[PDB]
Short mmCIF file of C-alpha atoms in Angstrom, two decimals:
data_model
loop_
_atom_site.label_atom_id
_atom_site.label_comp_id
_atom_site.label_asym_id
_atom_site.label_seq_id
_atom_site.Cartn_x
_atom_site.Cartn_y
_atom_site.Cartn_z
CA UNK A 1 -33.87 -28.99 14.40
CA UNK A 2 -34.85 -32.69 14.28
CA UNK A 3 -38.38 -31.71 13.18
CA UNK A 4 -36.97 -29.26 10.64
CA UNK A 5 -34.73 -31.97 9.18
CA UNK A 6 -37.58 -34.47 8.89
CA UNK A 7 -39.75 -31.73 7.41
CA UNK A 8 -37.02 -31.06 4.85
CA UNK A 9 -36.78 -34.70 3.78
CA UNK A 10 -40.50 -34.78 3.06
CA UNK A 11 -41.87 -35.18 -0.45
CA UNK A 12 -44.65 -32.81 0.39
CA UNK A 13 -43.36 -29.74 -1.43
CA UNK A 14 -45.26 -27.22 0.69
CA UNK A 15 -43.36 -28.70 3.60
CA UNK A 16 -40.00 -28.78 1.82
CA UNK A 17 -40.34 -25.06 1.15
CA UNK A 18 -41.47 -24.46 4.72
CA UNK A 19 -38.46 -26.31 6.13
CA UNK A 20 -35.99 -24.67 3.74
CA UNK A 21 -37.27 -21.23 4.75
CA UNK A 22 -36.87 -22.15 8.42
CA UNK A 23 -33.33 -23.34 7.69
CA UNK A 24 -32.71 -20.08 5.84
CA UNK A 25 -33.97 -17.97 8.74
CA UNK A 26 -31.70 -19.63 11.32
CA UNK A 27 -28.73 -19.35 8.98
CA UNK A 28 -29.84 -15.71 8.62
CA UNK A 29 -29.98 -15.06 12.37
CA UNK A 30 -28.40 -11.66 13.06
CA UNK A 31 -25.90 -13.17 15.50
CA UNK A 32 -24.22 -16.57 15.78
CA UNK A 33 -25.38 -18.56 12.74
CA UNK A 34 -25.63 -22.26 13.71
CA UNK A 35 -23.82 -23.42 10.55
CA UNK A 36 -22.24 -26.60 11.97
CA UNK A 37 -25.35 -27.95 13.68
CA UNK A 38 -26.99 -27.46 10.28
CA UNK A 39 -24.10 -29.28 8.62
CA UNK A 40 -24.26 -32.02 11.27
CA UNK A 41 -27.95 -32.43 10.43
CA UNK A 42 -26.70 -33.74 7.09
CA UNK A 43 -29.16 -31.52 5.24
CA UNK A 44 -26.65 -29.88 2.88
CA UNK A 45 -26.93 -32.44 0.06
CA UNK A 46 -30.72 -32.18 0.40
CA UNK A 47 -30.55 -28.39 0.01
CA UNK A 48 -28.43 -28.85 -3.12
CA UNK A 49 -31.21 -31.09 -4.47
CA UNK A 50 -33.59 -28.15 -4.12
CA UNK A 51 -31.47 -26.11 -6.54
CA UNK A 52 -31.65 -28.53 -9.46
CA UNK A 53 -33.56 -27.77 -12.65
CA UNK A 54 -37.34 -28.43 -12.48
CA UNK A 55 -37.58 -27.27 -8.84
CA UNK A 56 -40.01 -24.49 -7.88
CA UNK A 57 -37.99 -21.25 -8.12
CA UNK A 58 -39.02 -20.21 -4.62
CA UNK A 59 -37.47 -23.43 -3.34
CA UNK A 60 -34.32 -22.85 -5.41
CA UNK A 61 -34.11 -19.31 -4.02
CA UNK A 62 -34.45 -20.34 -0.38
CA UNK A 63 -32.07 -23.27 -0.81
CA UNK A 64 -29.42 -21.15 -2.54
CA UNK A 65 -29.82 -18.57 0.23
CA UNK A 66 -29.25 -21.17 2.95
CA UNK A 67 -26.24 -22.63 1.13
CA UNK A 68 -24.88 -19.12 0.55
CA UNK A 69 -24.67 -18.44 4.29
CA UNK A 70 -23.20 -21.87 5.05
CA UNK A 71 -20.50 -21.06 2.50
CA UNK A 72 -20.01 -17.69 4.19
CA UNK A 73 -18.56 -19.43 7.23
CA UNK A 74 -15.17 -21.04 7.83
CA UNK A 75 -13.16 -22.80 5.12
CA UNK A 76 -14.27 -26.16 6.50
CA UNK A 77 -17.91 -25.09 6.29
CA UNK A 78 -17.41 -23.80 2.75
CA UNK A 79 -15.86 -27.17 1.90
CA UNK A 80 -19.09 -28.98 2.83
CA UNK A 81 -21.01 -26.96 0.23
CA UNK A 82 -18.34 -27.50 -2.43
CA UNK A 83 -18.06 -31.24 -1.74
CA UNK A 84 -21.84 -31.44 -2.17
CA UNK A 85 -21.24 -30.35 -5.77
CA UNK A 86 -23.32 -27.20 -5.35
CA UNK A 87 -21.07 -25.05 -7.55
CA UNK A 88 -22.16 -26.44 -10.94
CA UNK A 89 -25.78 -25.92 -9.89
CA UNK A 90 -25.09 -22.34 -8.79
CA UNK A 91 -23.74 -21.70 -12.28
CA UNK A 92 -26.72 -23.45 -13.88
CA UNK A 93 -28.98 -21.06 -11.96
CA UNK A 94 -27.15 -18.14 -13.59
CA UNK A 95 -28.78 -19.26 -16.85
CA UNK A 96 -32.23 -20.39 -15.74
CA UNK A 97 -32.94 -18.33 -12.64
CA UNK A 98 -34.78 -15.07 -12.07
CA UNK A 99 -32.91 -11.91 -11.06
CA UNK A 100 -33.55 -12.88 -7.42
CA UNK A 101 -32.32 -16.45 -7.91
CA UNK A 102 -29.39 -15.25 -10.04
CA UNK A 103 -28.29 -12.74 -7.40
CA UNK A 104 -28.47 -15.54 -4.86
CA UNK A 105 -26.46 -17.93 -7.03
CA UNK A 106 -23.76 -15.37 -7.82
CA UNK A 107 -23.63 -14.48 -4.12
CA UNK A 108 -22.94 -18.11 -3.21
CA UNK A 109 -20.25 -18.36 -5.88
CA UNK A 110 -18.71 -15.22 -4.40
CA UNK A 111 -18.32 -16.90 -1.01
CA UNK A 112 -16.89 -20.04 -2.60
CA UNK A 113 -14.44 -18.07 -4.74
CA UNK A 114 -13.64 -15.84 -1.77
CA UNK A 115 -12.45 -18.79 0.31
CA UNK A 116 -9.14 -19.71 -1.33
CA UNK A 117 -7.24 -19.90 -4.61
CA UNK A 118 -8.30 -23.54 -4.94
CA UNK A 119 -12.02 -22.76 -4.85
CA UNK A 120 -11.47 -19.58 -6.87
CA UNK A 121 -9.88 -21.61 -9.65
CA UNK A 122 -12.43 -24.41 -9.18
CA UNK A 123 -15.30 -22.01 -9.86
CA UNK A 124 -13.46 -20.86 -12.98
CA UNK A 125 -12.81 -24.32 -14.44
CA UNK A 126 -16.50 -25.03 -13.87
CA UNK A 127 -16.89 -22.43 -16.64
CA UNK A 128 -18.54 -19.77 -14.48
CA UNK A 129 -17.03 -16.72 -16.18
CA UNK A 130 -19.27 -16.63 -19.28
CA UNK A 131 -22.65 -16.76 -17.53
CA UNK A 132 -21.32 -14.33 -14.90
CA UNK A 133 -20.35 -11.76 -17.53
CA UNK A 134 -23.81 -12.18 -19.03
CA UNK A 135 -25.34 -10.92 -15.79
CA UNK A 136 -24.03 -7.40 -16.34
CA UNK A 137 -26.69 -6.75 -18.98
CA UNK A 138 -29.17 -6.56 -16.11
CA UNK A 139 -31.14 -3.46 -15.09
CA UNK A 140 -30.94 -4.60 -11.46
CA UNK A 141 -28.42 -2.57 -9.42
CA UNK A 142 -28.26 -5.13 -6.58
CA UNK A 143 -27.65 -8.01 -8.99
CA UNK A 144 -24.81 -6.10 -10.64
CA UNK A 145 -23.45 -4.97 -7.26
CA UNK A 146 -23.30 -8.56 -6.04
CA UNK A 147 -21.97 -9.90 -9.35
CA UNK A 148 -19.18 -7.31 -9.30
CA UNK A 149 -18.14 -8.42 -5.81
CA UNK A 150 -18.08 -12.05 -6.94
CA UNK A 151 -16.17 -11.05 -10.07
CA UNK A 152 -13.53 -9.33 -7.94
CA UNK A 153 -13.08 -12.50 -5.89
CA UNK A 154 -12.44 -14.41 -9.11
CA UNK A 155 -9.69 -11.98 -10.15
CA UNK A 156 -8.23 -11.94 -6.64
CA UNK A 157 -5.25 -13.78 -5.15
CA UNK A 158 -1.65 -14.57 -6.03
CA UNK A 159 0.44 -17.76 -5.70
CA UNK A 160 -1.05 -18.80 -8.03
CA UNK A 161 -2.74 -16.10 -10.10
CA UNK A 162 -6.06 -17.02 -11.69
CA UNK A 163 -6.00 -18.28 -15.29
CA UNK A 164 -5.34 -15.06 -17.21
CA UNK A 165 -7.06 -16.32 -20.35
CA UNK A 166 -10.26 -16.59 -18.31
CA UNK A 167 -10.22 -13.55 -16.01
CA UNK A 168 -9.02 -11.19 -18.77
CA UNK A 169 -12.35 -11.75 -20.52
CA UNK A 170 -13.90 -9.56 -17.82
CA UNK A 171 -11.91 -6.47 -18.84
CA UNK A 172 -14.44 -4.95 -21.27
CA UNK A 173 -17.12 -5.38 -18.59
CA UNK A 174 -14.94 -3.93 -15.84
CA UNK A 175 -14.15 -1.00 -18.14
CA UNK A 176 -17.84 -0.09 -18.15
CA UNK A 177 -18.36 -0.83 -14.46
CA UNK A 178 -15.96 1.90 -13.35
CA UNK A 179 -18.42 4.41 -14.79
CA UNK A 180 -21.08 3.18 -12.37
CA UNK A 181 -23.02 5.51 -10.08
CA UNK A 182 -23.14 2.83 -7.39
CA UNK A 183 -20.20 3.26 -5.00
CA UNK A 184 -20.03 -0.37 -3.86
CA UNK A 185 -20.04 -1.49 -7.50
CA UNK A 186 -17.34 1.09 -8.20
CA UNK A 187 -15.12 -0.14 -5.37
CA UNK A 188 -15.16 -3.87 -6.15
CA UNK A 189 -14.68 -3.07 -9.84
CA UNK A 190 -11.52 -1.09 -9.10
CA UNK A 191 -10.22 -3.84 -6.82
CA UNK A 192 -10.77 -6.39 -9.58
CA UNK A 193 -8.80 -4.23 -12.03
CA UNK A 194 -6.01 -3.69 -9.49
CA UNK A 195 -5.70 -7.48 -9.30
CA UNK A 196 -5.69 -7.97 -13.07
CA UNK A 197 -3.20 -5.16 -13.64
CA UNK A 198 -0.92 -6.81 -11.09
CA UNK A 199 1.09 -8.97 -13.47
CA UNK A 200 3.34 -8.99 -16.56
CA UNK A 201 3.40 -6.30 -19.26
CA UNK A 202 1.00 -8.45 -21.28
CA UNK A 203 -1.55 -8.07 -18.50
CA UNK A 204 -0.94 -4.32 -18.21
CA UNK A 205 -1.30 -3.90 -21.98
CA UNK A 206 -4.68 -5.64 -21.83
CA UNK A 207 -5.86 -3.11 -19.25
CA UNK A 208 -4.58 -0.29 -21.47
CA UNK A 209 -6.22 -1.70 -24.60
CA UNK A 210 -9.70 -1.61 -23.04
CA UNK A 211 -8.91 2.02 -22.19
CA UNK A 212 -9.26 1.68 -18.43
CA UNK A 213 -6.29 3.90 -17.31
CA UNK A 214 -7.86 7.31 -18.10
CA UNK A 215 -10.96 6.54 -16.03
CA UNK A 216 -8.76 5.26 -13.20
CA UNK A 217 -6.93 8.59 -13.07
CA UNK A 218 -10.32 10.30 -12.89
CA UNK A 219 -11.37 8.08 -9.98
CA UNK A 220 -8.31 9.22 -8.01
CA UNK A 221 -10.22 12.40 -7.20
CA UNK A 222 -13.28 10.48 -5.97
CA UNK A 223 -14.49 11.65 -2.56
CA UNK A 224 -14.21 8.18 -1.00
CA UNK A 225 -10.83 6.65 -0.14
CA UNK A 226 -12.60 3.31 -0.64
CA UNK A 227 -12.48 4.20 -4.34
CA UNK A 228 -9.11 5.96 -4.32
CA UNK A 229 -7.19 3.05 -2.79
CA UNK A 230 -7.88 0.35 -5.40
CA UNK A 231 -7.75 2.97 -8.18
CA UNK A 232 -4.33 4.20 -7.05
CA UNK A 233 -3.17 0.60 -6.73
CA UNK A 234 -4.30 -0.20 -10.27
CA UNK A 235 -2.58 2.91 -11.63
CA UNK A 236 0.54 2.07 -9.64
CA UNK A 237 0.55 -1.43 -11.12
CA UNK A 238 0.31 -0.13 -14.68
CA UNK A 239 3.36 2.15 -14.35
CA UNK A 240 5.47 -0.84 -13.32
CA UNK A 241 5.39 -1.66 -17.03
CA UNK A 242 7.60 -0.19 -19.74
CA UNK A 243 8.03 3.46 -20.73
CA UNK A 244 5.30 3.36 -23.38
CA UNK A 245 2.74 1.87 -21.00
CA UNK A 246 3.77 4.38 -18.33
CA UNK A 247 3.39 7.27 -20.78
CA UNK A 248 -0.26 6.31 -21.26
CA UNK A 249 -0.84 6.96 -17.56
CA UNK A 250 1.11 10.22 -17.78
CA UNK A 251 -0.92 11.43 -20.76
CA UNK A 252 -4.00 10.62 -18.67
CA UNK A 253 -2.83 13.30 -16.24
CA UNK A 254 -1.80 11.14 -13.28
CA UNK A 255 0.88 13.56 -12.06
CA UNK A 256 -1.42 16.36 -10.86
CA UNK A 257 -3.61 13.68 -9.27
CA UNK A 258 -0.64 12.17 -7.44
CA UNK A 259 0.33 15.56 -6.00
CA UNK A 260 -3.10 15.76 -4.38
CA UNK A 261 -2.75 12.22 -3.03
CA UNK A 262 0.54 13.11 -1.34
CA UNK A 263 -1.49 15.17 1.13
CA UNK A 264 -3.94 12.37 1.92
CA UNK A 265 -4.93 11.77 5.56
CA UNK A 266 -4.42 8.07 4.83
CA UNK A 267 -0.77 7.10 5.26
CA UNK A 268 -1.07 4.14 2.90
CA UNK A 269 -2.33 6.41 0.12
CA UNK A 270 0.66 8.71 0.59
CA UNK A 271 2.93 5.67 0.44
CA UNK A 272 1.47 4.20 -2.75
CA UNK A 273 1.43 7.67 -4.31
CA UNK A 274 5.17 7.86 -3.68
CA UNK A 275 5.48 4.31 -5.00
CA UNK A 276 3.60 5.24 -8.18
CA UNK A 277 5.76 8.34 -8.70
CA UNK A 278 8.93 6.29 -8.16
CA UNK A 279 8.02 3.91 -10.98
CA UNK A 280 7.45 6.92 -13.23
CA UNK A 281 10.81 8.47 -12.36
CA UNK A 282 12.21 5.02 -13.13
CA UNK A 283 11.44 5.75 -16.78
CA UNK A 284 13.18 7.93 -19.36
CA UNK A 285 14.49 11.48 -18.95
CA UNK A 286 11.33 13.11 -20.35
CA UNK A 287 9.15 11.28 -17.82
CA UNK A 288 11.43 12.37 -14.98
CA UNK A 289 11.11 15.93 -16.26
CA UNK A 290 7.32 15.56 -16.26
CA UNK A 291 7.44 14.59 -12.58
CA UNK A 292 9.55 17.66 -11.81
CA UNK A 293 7.30 19.96 -13.84
CA UNK A 294 4.32 18.67 -11.86
CA UNK A 295 5.87 20.11 -8.67
CA UNK A 296 6.18 16.64 -7.14
CA UNK A 297 9.72 16.86 -5.76
CA UNK A 298 9.14 19.22 -2.80
CA UNK A 299 6.42 17.09 -1.17
CA UNK A 300 8.50 13.96 -1.86
CA UNK A 301 11.52 15.51 -0.14
CA UNK A 302 9.48 16.41 2.94
CA UNK A 303 7.99 12.92 3.11
CA UNK A 304 11.51 11.52 2.74
CA UNK A 305 12.48 13.49 5.84
CA UNK A 306 9.40 13.27 8.09
CA UNK A 307 6.96 10.52 7.00
CA UNK A 308 6.65 6.98 8.40
CA UNK A 309 9.42 4.63 7.24
CA UNK A 310 7.25 2.52 4.92
CA UNK A 311 6.38 5.78 3.16
CA UNK A 312 9.96 7.09 3.32
CA UNK A 313 11.16 4.03 1.38
CA UNK A 314 9.03 4.86 -1.66
CA UNK A 315 9.91 8.55 -1.55
CA UNK A 316 13.55 7.46 -1.56
CA UNK A 317 12.96 5.30 -4.64
CA UNK A 318 11.38 8.26 -6.42
CA UNK A 319 14.18 10.72 -5.71
CA UNK A 320 16.85 8.08 -6.37
CA UNK A 321 15.32 7.01 -9.68
CA UNK A 322 14.98 10.66 -10.67
CA UNK A 323 18.69 11.15 -9.99
CA UNK A 324 19.54 8.57 -12.66
CA UNK A 325 18.32 11.14 -15.15
CA UNK A 326 21.22 13.25 -13.94
CA UNK A 327 23.90 11.76 -16.17
CA UNK A 328 21.92 12.73 -19.27
CA UNK A 329 20.38 15.94 -17.92
CA UNK A 330 22.52 17.42 -15.09
CA UNK A 331 19.91 20.11 -14.31
CA UNK A 332 17.82 17.32 -12.81
CA UNK A 333 20.44 16.78 -10.11
CA UNK A 334 20.89 20.53 -9.64
CA UNK A 335 17.17 20.83 -9.00
CA UNK A 336 17.11 17.81 -6.67
CA UNK A 337 19.99 19.10 -4.54
CA UNK A 338 18.42 22.57 -4.60
CA UNK A 339 15.24 21.14 -3.07
CA UNK A 340 17.28 19.77 -0.16
CA UNK A 341 17.22 16.05 -0.91
CA UNK A 342 20.77 15.26 0.21
CA UNK A 343 20.28 15.40 3.98
CA UNK A 344 17.09 13.29 4.09
CA UNK A 345 18.82 10.74 1.85
CA UNK A 346 21.87 10.63 4.12
CA UNK A 347 19.84 10.36 7.34
CA UNK A 348 18.13 7.30 5.86
CA UNK A 349 21.37 5.29 5.66
CA UNK A 350 21.52 4.65 9.42
CA UNK A 351 18.01 3.22 9.72
CA UNK A 352 17.14 1.75 6.32
CA UNK A 353 17.28 -1.85 5.10
CA UNK A 354 19.98 -3.06 2.70
CA UNK A 355 17.83 -2.62 -0.41
CA UNK A 356 16.97 1.00 0.43
CA UNK A 357 20.57 1.67 1.48
CA UNK A 358 21.59 0.46 -1.98
CA UNK A 359 18.89 2.64 -3.53
CA UNK A 360 20.07 5.58 -1.44
CA UNK A 361 23.76 5.04 -2.25
CA UNK A 362 23.01 5.06 -5.98
CA UNK A 363 21.18 8.35 -5.52
CA UNK A 364 24.12 9.81 -3.62
CA UNK A 365 26.64 8.58 -6.20
CA UNK A 366 24.59 10.09 -9.04
CA UNK A 367 24.64 13.38 -7.15
CA UNK A 368 28.39 12.97 -6.67
CA UNK A 369 29.17 12.00 -10.28
CA UNK A 370 27.22 15.05 -11.43
CA UNK A 371 28.83 17.30 -8.84
CA UNK A 372 32.08 15.81 -9.98
CA UNK A 373 31.25 16.63 -13.64
CA UNK A 374 30.40 20.18 -12.52
CA UNK A 375 34.10 20.53 -11.73
CA UNK A 376 35.77 19.79 -15.11
CA UNK A 377 33.35 22.26 -16.62
CA UNK A 378 32.82 19.19 -5.43
CA UNK A 379 29.84 21.18 -4.14
CA UNK A 380 27.69 18.08 -3.65
CA UNK A 381 30.45 16.25 -1.81
CA UNK A 382 30.68 19.25 0.52
CA UNK A 383 26.91 19.24 1.00
CA UNK A 384 27.04 15.51 1.74
CA UNK A 385 29.78 15.95 4.35
CA UNK A 386 27.86 18.78 6.03
CA UNK A 387 24.79 16.54 5.86
CA UNK A 388 26.75 14.05 7.94
CA UNK A 389 26.47 11.70 4.99
CA UNK A 390 30.20 11.21 4.37
CA UNK A 391 30.28 9.57 7.79
CA UNK A 392 27.19 7.49 6.98
CA UNK A 393 28.59 6.30 3.65
CA UNK A 394 31.86 5.37 5.35
CA UNK A 395 29.95 3.36 7.96
CA UNK A 396 28.25 1.42 5.15
CA UNK A 397 31.64 -0.21 4.56
CA UNK A 398 30.92 -2.09 7.79
CA UNK A 399 27.89 -3.68 6.14
CA UNK A 400 27.92 -7.48 5.90
CA UNK A 401 26.49 -7.40 2.37
CA UNK A 402 29.15 -7.16 -0.35
CA UNK A 403 27.45 -4.94 -2.96
CA UNK A 404 26.84 -2.25 -0.35
CA UNK A 405 30.46 -2.45 0.79
CA UNK A 406 31.88 -2.30 -2.74
CA UNK A 407 29.54 0.60 -3.44
CA UNK A 408 30.37 2.56 -0.28
CA UNK A 409 34.06 1.80 -0.78
CA UNK A 410 34.27 3.30 -4.27
CA UNK A 411 32.16 6.29 -3.27
CA UNK A 412 34.53 7.07 -0.41
CA UNK A 413 37.64 6.44 -2.51
CA UNK A 414 36.45 8.38 -5.58
CA UNK A 415 34.89 11.50 -4.06
CA UNK A 416 36.28 11.60 -0.52
CA UNK B 1 14.44 0.27 -12.55
CA UNK B 2 10.86 -0.51 -11.50
CA UNK B 3 9.82 -2.18 -8.23
CA UNK B 4 6.85 -3.42 -6.19
CA UNK B 5 6.64 -2.75 -2.49
CA UNK B 6 2.84 -9.99 0.23
CA UNK B 7 0.68 -12.88 -0.97
CA UNK B 8 -1.96 -13.19 1.63
CA UNK B 9 -5.30 -14.83 1.02
CA UNK B 10 -7.66 -13.37 3.64
CA UNK B 11 -11.17 -14.85 3.26
CA UNK B 12 -13.52 -12.47 1.42
CA UNK B 13 -17.01 -13.66 2.30
CA UNK B 14 -20.42 -12.07 2.84
CA UNK B 15 -23.36 -13.60 4.68
CA UNK B 16 -26.87 -12.48 3.75
CA UNK B 17 -28.35 -10.96 6.90
#
């Protein structure tokens, strides 16, 4: 290393390139990259020098490569590269470089952005977005694959979110990228969209306006779960918006897709499928009817009764939200009770958290109010007692939280 | 009403090997 360092600080350029390559190789060792002994050599600012304009492009390439891997280490190691002011030069290389240098520069920026929200935002206020978006006019798959990964890191992270006015500029590009034949490009593109769609209704509308949702629904049937997971997440984020925005996803045919996803070998996919459905049944009566027509209730009921708890929660939300459509259209409740939803709802009261208990109690009251209305014109109350639920609801009066008590109290007093 | 079912910043880095 001491000879490599001296060789690097030469002014012989042959030698500078020779030393940089040697530094690159050791930082590219297949196991245990000696990043900190390289940092301790104090060669990082020198490597950044090799990336400036007017350097031989082979030297820029090898330097950017070495700095890329140093930045791929711990946060402290990434900090050394950032504090050496390498980021503005990385971005400069996105203009002046070749496809090989540009892929290297965007790779480095990906590691910097992928460190923390601070460095993510830092890359963005260094005005990196515009030259980055310009890269996607390339005919190089690997350049676009790497740039998409970097782009996803820029859209990633909450507390705080990235500057929306900046990252939203990527939406037309991301809209095209989800039509890619390259799987790795496809995956990171969907993750980026899932991040961007995770926000206010203004953010969701932006995703809708660039006509992303329909392609997302298509990608739900992709063979790889690596594609399905961020796609389902993005779709699930969109339907957290208002009824109009949700209807866009419905018109895109998400309901038959979600039925397929309910039988996924991945538990987390089944959970987020339930979660997506629940935010659709949270909409108007017509949208609840659409869920029912799509034959989604029977697998939801079974998941409510057998699945893992984290999945049960979302299935509960779906059935409970659907029951709210019961006051306006009582046949919704009749169908829900007919599909045996009462007992799995009741059984949940003894194990669930206070929020789900509250969700469950609202479902049970809706069923009761309807069953009560189907009297002046209680079956459901009888079904609930036989379900062992009357006991469970009574026990909820022993809950420390007031809104659950008040709720359970009125339910018991009104219908029992 | 709608709902979301954790703000964790795992490092997302790739070394060139």
